[PDB]
Amino acid sequence: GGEARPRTVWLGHPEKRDQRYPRNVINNQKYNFFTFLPGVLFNQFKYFFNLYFLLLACSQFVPEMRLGALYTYWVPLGFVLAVTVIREAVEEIRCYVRDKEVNSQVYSRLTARGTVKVKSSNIQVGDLIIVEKNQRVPADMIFLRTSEKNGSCFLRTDQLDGETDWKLRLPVACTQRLPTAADLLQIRSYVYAEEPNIDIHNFVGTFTREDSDPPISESLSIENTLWAGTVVASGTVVGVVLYTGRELRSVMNTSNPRSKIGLFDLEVNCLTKILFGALVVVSLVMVALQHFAGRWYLQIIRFLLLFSNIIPISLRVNLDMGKIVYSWVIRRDSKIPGTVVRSSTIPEQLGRISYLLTDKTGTLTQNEMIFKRLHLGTVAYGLDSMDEVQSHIFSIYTQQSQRTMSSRVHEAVKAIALCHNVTPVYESNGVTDQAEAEKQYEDSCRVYQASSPDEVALVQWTESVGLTLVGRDQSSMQLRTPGDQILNFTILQIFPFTYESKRMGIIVRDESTGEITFYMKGADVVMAGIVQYNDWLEEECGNMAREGLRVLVVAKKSLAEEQYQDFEARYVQAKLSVHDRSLKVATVIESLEMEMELLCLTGVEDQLQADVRPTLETLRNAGIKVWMLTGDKLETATCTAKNAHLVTRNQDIHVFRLVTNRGEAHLELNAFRRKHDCALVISGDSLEVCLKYYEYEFMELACQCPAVVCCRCAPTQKAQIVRLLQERTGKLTCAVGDGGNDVSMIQESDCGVGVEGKEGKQASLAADFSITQFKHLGRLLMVHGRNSYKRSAALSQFVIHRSLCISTMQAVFSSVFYFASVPLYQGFLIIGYSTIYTMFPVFSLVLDKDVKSEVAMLYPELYKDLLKGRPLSYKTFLIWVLISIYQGSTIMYGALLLFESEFVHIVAISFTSLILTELLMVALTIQTWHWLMTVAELLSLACYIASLVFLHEFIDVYFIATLSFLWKVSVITLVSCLPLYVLKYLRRRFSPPSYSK
């Protein structure tokens, strides 16, 4: 609402404030109570198709421009308006209802009298909120206090930025050292924070405690923050709220909900202007026939009003009820269960998607990593050979009290169990205490915690193999053997993992034998020169990486009691330096990283969701280009692309390097252009430079690519890529995601599909369609999307044909019969009333199918036909227009020739010959017959014969029931329908359709 300013937030006291802060509520609604009606009415009557019916009714207030009754212009308009309002109201109420699950979650609040329970929507700035383990963070907070004695916590942020790594956060130093949690309320402290912005990974703030005799000021960064939408992984934490509601970092990265219109609806709207333009041209030309005769304008509007049914109100009604049937079918399909249709007015856009932009974390992957392959050079182990590694480990320790391949397996497993940064955590199961399970090393209470999920998966595998990690401190590790002996190790030097070095190291001392070993693990690129000569490391790493695995190289070096002293006494010297510490310390570490004994290669896989590989292949065979836009790091994203077969096994990958300016971006864009059939991997930082200077050049090069992978993408960058694809290509795009960082790109895309996340529902709540699994996307496109697009095209073009045949008939009647009369207008409406006996059979076109659901799934090439716009184009429209003119002329001119006796005897043959003609045309169009199509065509015949019997006795119209009436009606129908009943038969022979084979 206003320019954001910095705020001073006092601990407790949600009343010492300057401005007023927004409610901590999440809203996905388009309108509130006040803006509902103006918004719904304006979004409807701003299109020529809907505004046309409103101007017709308003013209009737003028007495000189009045024609017909007044309830024939407003009752159809009122019924149409009464469906848009009810349909829009139902959508808003359920959006409100589905927003109540997140907004009504119960948390705890520290008050002066004790902890009380608060709802998420009632949380205020300055409140002290308690968030427990595995719970969502309700608002943006500053980490104040934790219940653990390690003084930190881990955060899962996959629903905020799409990163698989856990984030370590630390509390404010003063608040963590207080004896009691309630002590935070008896101190005079405030937090000075920057104005709300969009940056998720940056924060500037200050913590000040006035009470202490020496005032204390701490600088705060992202390490002290707990943003909303994250999940606490360990223990209960206490924080103070800074931002609520629309000022949340997640919400500030989200756009406002909008009302979407489909491309199909934009094309029917264009056809109505052509139909209206043709009618006006006739009116303007017809008044030139008289060379103008005074008050010429009174005749044009009268002519326009009389032939106003060239655009029928049944086009709006039939399309509205058709879309109701499509959403009913999608909500009830048992082969894609759990699908919710939120935007029920665009089901036909699912059948013309050209670009599919998808998230990686949580959409394609299960967010679960597992150890898969161990390679010792001379032998490899997989999930089916892990029962032999357990025997090698058991053999050594069963023979401890009682080289070979058993001693080569043991050396590799012991290295994986020591070279990491994983700390075991014990928690009270309810009978056993945290202080008792720690002593006895119970397995059911143990949890492994680390920043890297890969390290946790490695440690979880050694436990299942025989070597368990039961304890860890800052200077000690404890391992349990198959014979339940505890091995104690002393951590002497640890070198943590950095994304620049891409490797990790540790030095340990065995307290049983006294030996000192140096362990190092890292990527194959950096560890190739560190290890001794071999002939299998580079070969097998490429084979491992080509399977979508994450490969680490493990090495060893035994140090004596003299080389460590030459290192320890030299490593400390570099630390106590004040000039260039980074390069001084580094040169001492790389002096130890030479001639290391290679041990093994480990492969870790991030598990895909069910049927991800077949689904991606099906979409690619349908002509849909798939891009992966993820907020995760480059290395993890490339592994998932190869694992999911987004990039083919033989495909070549070009990795875009870090460009920082206009000059560097031009060089790298020319380098990529010189490649052929290459997949593009580019980071968000390099993408910002490329889109700034070479937006056209970059976009054209990426659209010829087989696949494009964008990593470390901000939520605004994902929506920017979607917008440029729409502008530069003019084709529909689809966006699939599961987290809160994909809401921006789902709202921007033409068709937004949200996958229901495991720890969040924000993307599912903001999408047009919500699915529970990624594999449900294939059937939602090739079956439901294709049928909706094909049924709408056939149904809309038949209503237009029916209204154009009537207009042609009532133009021959108005000239070739009388050229002027008052009784004509009575027959003018009788002909137009013939659409009552075709009301049901034409609507039964929503039941039609060309192929079966098991055939559209097996042959994705049927989908590329819809991408060309074949169902509705200018060719199909023109053919339908020519048939309408031919059929209307044949019925009317055949009525005035076969029996030109009287007016009553002429509206009896033409009205009959038109119902039969339209009933026969529906039977011609239907490809697959349903049993409801049969009763619809046979009930309409019955109520027409019945209506020709009741009026037969009352009105003296015995002319109907004879033999003379029979042959003239039969002849006219045969001349009308049969020529179009033979061309279709010839079409099958000469030009068969692909779905027929």
Ligand SMILES: CCCCCCCC/C=C\CCCCCCCC(=O)OC[C@H](COP(=O)(O)OCC[N+](C)(C)C)OC(=O)CCCCCCC/C=C\CCCCCCCC
């Ligand atoms: C043979 C084929 C080739 C043609 C040859 C030449 C023929 C020339 C004759 C007609 C052609 C020009 C008129 C075409 C129809 C209007 C087209 C138009 O440019 O539309 C302007 C907009 C509709 O834009 P949109 O929906 O495409 O934009 C969608 C995008 N968005 C909404 C975000 C902006 O606004 C509107 O609909 C207002 C449009 C004008 C008002 C409606 C006209 C019909 C209604 C009543 C007629 C008179 C009845 C009596 C009225 C008495 C009142 C007292």
Ligand SMILES: CCCCCCCCCCCCCCCCCC(=O)OC[C@H](COP(=O)(O)OC[C@H](N)C(=O)O)OC(=O)CCCCCCCCCCCCCCCCC
């Ligand atoms: C003020 C608020 C009012 C709220 C509603 C109140 C309702 C009150 C009812 C009062 C009695 C009924 C009055 C009906 C008025 C319309 C009569 C009618 O049928 O028109 C037929 C119309 C053409 O009409 P016209 O007279 O030639 O011209 C009108 C005017 N002179 C004009 O040109 O301007 O030709 C058409 O255009 C057809 C129009 C209907 C279209 C229906 C299409 C089919 C829909 C789908 C049917 C199948 C559905 C199946 C569902 C599932 C079933 C199992």
Ligand SMILES: CC(C)CCC[C@@H](C)[C@H]1CC[C@H]2[C@@H]3CC=C4C[C@@H](O)CC[C@]4(C)[C@H]3CC[C@]12C
């Ligand atoms: C002129 C209109 C009113 C009626 C048209 C004929 C009527 C009786 C309808 C009712 C049942 C319909 C049939 C239902 C089933 C099939 C099987 C299908 O594989 C070919 C079409 C065919 C054979 C349909 C032809 C048209 C049909 C025979």
Ligand code: ALF
């Ligand atoms: F799950 Al993502 F970017 F891969 F939000």
Ligand SMILES: [Mg+2]
């Ligand atoms: Mg995600």
